[PDB]
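Input structure tokens:
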């Protein structure tokens, strides 16, 4: 792989998360029934694939050279929170505070990985 791929995947997840946050808020304000098999399920499946490939790349990144601000446990925690964030953006059952907490957690780790990449890619 190239750090370039990881970076793109990182930015893709950030966008999924930010667009997800807006979808969540819009759903709480004025609910809309999203289709399960045609929209929700495929969104989770696609993002599940994205998250897995990202994690493997992120983990590779930290093994080759010990990064300054990102560690394994942090990378591993993204998956479950990210997937919950995706599902809830459509069904929005969880409360505002909880949605914010997982979104904040996911975004920070994503930004951290992004920072490490840029820092090490610039030598």
């Amino acid at each position: 792989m190239l750090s370039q791929t990881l970076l793109e995947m990182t930015e893709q997840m950030i966008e999924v998360a930010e667009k997800g946050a807006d979808r969540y808020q819009e759903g709480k304000n004025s609910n809309h029934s999203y289709d399960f098999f045609e929209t929700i399920k495929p969104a989770v499946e696609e993002n599940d694939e994205l998250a897995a490939r990202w994690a493997e790349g992120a983990l590779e990144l930290i093994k080759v050279r010990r990064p300054k601000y990102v560690h394994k446990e942090q990378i591993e925690a993204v998956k479950d929170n990210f997937l919950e964030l995706v599902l809830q953006s459509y069904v929005h059952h969880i409360h505002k505070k909880r949605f914010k907490d997982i979104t904040e957690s996911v975004l920070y780790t994503l930004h951290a990985v992004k920072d490490e990449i840029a820092r090490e890619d610039s030598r």
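The first helix runs from residue 3 to 29. The CA atoms of residues 35 and 41 lie 9 Å apart.
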